[PDB]
Amino acid sequence: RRDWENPGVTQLNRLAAHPPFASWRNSEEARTDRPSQQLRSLNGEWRFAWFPAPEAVPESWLECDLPEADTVVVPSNWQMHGYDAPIYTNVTYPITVNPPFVPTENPTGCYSLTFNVDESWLQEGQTRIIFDGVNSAFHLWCNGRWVGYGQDSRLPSEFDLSAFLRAGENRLAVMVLRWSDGSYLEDQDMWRMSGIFRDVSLLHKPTTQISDFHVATRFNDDFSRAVLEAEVQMCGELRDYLRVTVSLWQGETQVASGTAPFGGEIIDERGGYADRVTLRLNVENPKLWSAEIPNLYRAVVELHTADGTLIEAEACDVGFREVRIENGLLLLNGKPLLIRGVNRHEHHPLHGQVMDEQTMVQDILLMKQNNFNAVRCSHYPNHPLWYTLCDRYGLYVVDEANIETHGMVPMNRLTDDPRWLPAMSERVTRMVQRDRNHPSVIIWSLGNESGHGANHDALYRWIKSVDPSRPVQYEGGGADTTATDIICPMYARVDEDQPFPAVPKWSIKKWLSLPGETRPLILCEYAHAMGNSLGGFAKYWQAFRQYPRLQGGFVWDWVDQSLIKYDENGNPWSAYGGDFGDTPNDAQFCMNGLVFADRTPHPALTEAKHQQQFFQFRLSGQTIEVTSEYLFRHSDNELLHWMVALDGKPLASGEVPLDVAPQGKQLIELPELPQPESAGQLWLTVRVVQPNATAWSEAGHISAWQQWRLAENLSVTLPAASHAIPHLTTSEMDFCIELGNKRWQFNRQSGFLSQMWIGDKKQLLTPLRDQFTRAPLDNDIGVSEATRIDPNAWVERWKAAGHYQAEAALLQCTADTLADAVLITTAHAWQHQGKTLFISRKTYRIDGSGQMAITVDVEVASDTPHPARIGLNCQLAQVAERVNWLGLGPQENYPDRLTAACFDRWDLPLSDMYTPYVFPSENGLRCGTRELNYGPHQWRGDFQFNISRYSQQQLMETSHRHLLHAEEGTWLNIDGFHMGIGGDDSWSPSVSAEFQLSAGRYHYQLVWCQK
Amino acid sequence: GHYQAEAALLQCTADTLADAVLITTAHAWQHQGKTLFISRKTYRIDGSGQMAITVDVEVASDTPHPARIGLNCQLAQVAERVNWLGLGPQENYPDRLTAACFDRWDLPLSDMYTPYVFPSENGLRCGTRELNYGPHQWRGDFQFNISRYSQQQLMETSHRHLLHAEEGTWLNIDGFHMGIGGDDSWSPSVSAEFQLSAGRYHYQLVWCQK
């Protein structure tokens, strides 16, 4: 039959989907959500054997363990065990596009387990086996007999084993196929793996059982009253003494209850459902659920008898909240939401796509700690525990169907084909049946990147009909089709339109007001955080706050999908596409996260946290105005700390408790600030601290901050005149200046400062030269490949123009002896094929105080692509432990990504000045710096800089961070100006005009001295 | 105190280079003990008779952004024509220069003055690389206006018919000029991108003979 090559067969003998069941036989255990003896986990050590195709599987395997098989842990992805290689491809399918066929060589994983079952389970009741996740299709055997078949790698497949089990030992035989017709609907941009990657368990329910139950909550106008309606369905023989009781609990307090016999209301001419009943409980002044305050109740569903005998009990956490779109706004409990979300794949560097509680909790804590309040399940239903945690910790969830056909041409070839409607319907309907009772889920998504087809419209309506409590969204086909209640574009820019044919990405502000449009707009994906990115993130949030209908979005994405590999020495390293022999592949495009695979934060995370703050501030005179963006909670665990400092030097500070109602405002009058003596700029820094710990944060957690420049007193005091005078020495090859034990040498042939001496020790390993390029960021590269060059990408434009090839040509180099100093004047021209790209004119003034003032004026040809930077660089012989600077920090920050950084005195170890992006590139820059200190060196001015043991050349020539090696001394890159990093997307130029170095003429000055 | 600011000399030195004389100066503008602006310049005069002027200005971040950052002087010369290579031919400002075109323009001096009934700063031309007037030529990248009326007379006269040509020609050469605004005329309307808020400014000019 080859059921894995037929979209018409997505399962055989599979049981109906339903909400989380545990079949408790004790009401109190159900109420407390404690373990159930009727729900057994089969996770642990199983027997596994890999085969190149289903036809290679020996028939004996059904009856007994294969002596060649290994004992492995389940759940797991067999690629993580090394049986075959994981494949990383973005859009292009990992297999030949020829629906519904798959490769004849179909990696097959044969799992098996010998287990025993409780005696009583064999004599009464129903015993089913549940596979929460099998990638991507499989056949099931029990004690040699065929049981069933199942598809869809992201939802549980259940089968009844009652007629197969026997006393003593039993044996399961699971043949998992890597490829199947289901693969055509699972083309998500992630590693392609396979196996039994989610829990496996046995559930024992009575013959007369609760087969399904739905919880709904409706409210009155001001949410002071609510009605909980619970529909309960049963299977088995109906008896007049049967009853169903639904009790609602708030802690150990029962707040409401309803009991009734089966027999629903009349629905049509043939009657009603005799096997169903709906209980309605009134709840006065319910505690409402939200991400701000995840108030939850406990609903216990008891199937019992009229005289008081319990047959079975199920239960779920209940969150009282209303989600609806009114007048173009998405409202949660009547208030317009502002989605601070992120897309999150289920990925672990060591375990692949197998999820665990520890990792899930870690992500949620980090997310809330960084001001995120929502998550999108990109791009499939998640491990069941995830929804539980979101319900309890408080995160708005977008539950998404496991449907992506990105690789088709056109993208909707399958989704507009009725032949594929059945397969698609199961991926949507079974998701709803499983998660419809989770309050954290507030929006349903029909899938991802599958164009727009009629099947989408059909399924959009199906959801609208069965569950009107949640809006339905889908981005495919233009982001505003008839299959979505929310305009949910991906990477639509703030002000810039991208008029693509048929599926344009309009500026988000413009999109909202297109003729006839009235829907809210929430980006399903934006700010592609690939490598050194998130430039321009602040632009989105400013728009979100100004426009009511722009209600946020989900950053792409949470964590780098890098995998761990080990070198010959057994040392681990982060690997990406192609590092497993997998080909074709899409290399580093699997790493687009705000945090590294091991959950270590990328510098971009702090920018997201800052822009996503829940408190806004304004300063006027001595008054600070705090505005709350919370919709439901009061600032009941917030303290405001304020600090005033003169160029890093703290002068005054204090703290005030925040007492702001949601959407409210609080005025804080700062005490009189005593005018500082010294000259300089006074800076005000405010930060909101949470004194008490929470379920997701430690005491002292900082949730928001902001800075303002206060009074500034320009220095008019002239420096103390020195007695000594620098002495100029000349030769045919160099200009040397001497002052005390210091010496500066300028090469007359190159026109650069080639050496400096402090006593007899050389200070430079490489001359101080202008630099106009940078080791290309992923955003600079885009999708440009050696075999497939994208002439439009910034890196290709710089290459074609000769920016990396340009050679400095000396035009002038002279020395003059002034009254109290020596003046070196130079001028260089950088050309490529007879074209002058840049011209640099400088003057170096070395005075009797030992300070060298460097003045730089650069000309950039208006027709050459704007340069990545305009500065100087050199390799210092010095290798110090610390880096101290007065400027923006402490973390890496760039022109279009520096709002989170604060101006102050920062001091960190040299290693912290380097950001370990898996794919090496320009990194570690810090902007708005007025003073830099390293070893005996001090540089002053107003510049940007990065300092490390890796040169731009090495970073630019190394594909993985583990292959980098510290060079001799330290490489210093001091820029007068630096280009934005961009990031609206990473496959097209995304650096906004205001951050491009297009002025044509640039000026900057530096003062180099010994401290 | 921008209109009252007094220039205080901080430094004035002279050096003799191999092929030129270098003059260095520094001034502080203050009002009631507050330093509003600091101007540091160098004047380099070579054998070609050209005077290269470099200007680097500091503006206190807490003082309201200044209307302009430039130089001015009253020339003894009164010429009939004004010739420049920059945006024109009509008056244009930073936030109102899209209509102007870059080219070689030559107009009678009177056309370099816009007769607004209520006198004010007027006649500026932006993005100018070369300006010619009489025996003078200024080169660089600046904005400028030139007329027989000082900024002082313009702001002290309520009607254009009461203006009187002063001796010589007043020249205002700006490295930078603030936008004029206009979204309305009863509240500040100059957009942020056209306000001089950089804190530190640099511009250079070359004064020589045409």
Ligand SMILES: CC(C)S[C@@H]1O[C@H](CO)[C@H](O)[C@H](O)[C@H]1O
């Ligand atoms: C190849 C791009 C033009 S499509 C682009 O690739 C990205 C890779 O991180 C993400 O998967 C986006 O969702 C997808 O639209």
Ligand SMILES: CC(C)S[C@@H]1O[C@H](CO)[C@H](O)[C@H](O)[C@H]1O
């Ligand atoms: C600092 C808050 C956002 S944590 C927030 O406070 C709420 C009370 O206002 C509830 O205690 C929530 O459970 C808690 O997560």
Ligand SMILES: [Mg+2]
């Ligand atoms: Mg099939």
Ligand SMILES: [Mg+2]
């Ligand atoms: Mg895709």
Ligand SMILES: [Mg+2]
């Ligand atoms: Mg700020």
Ligand code: NA
């Ligand atoms: Na909004």
Ligand code: NA
């Ligand atoms: Na990706």
Ligand code: NA
């Ligand atoms: Na508080």
Ligand code: NA
């Ligand atoms: Na690289």
Ligand code: NA
């Ligand atoms: Na006037």
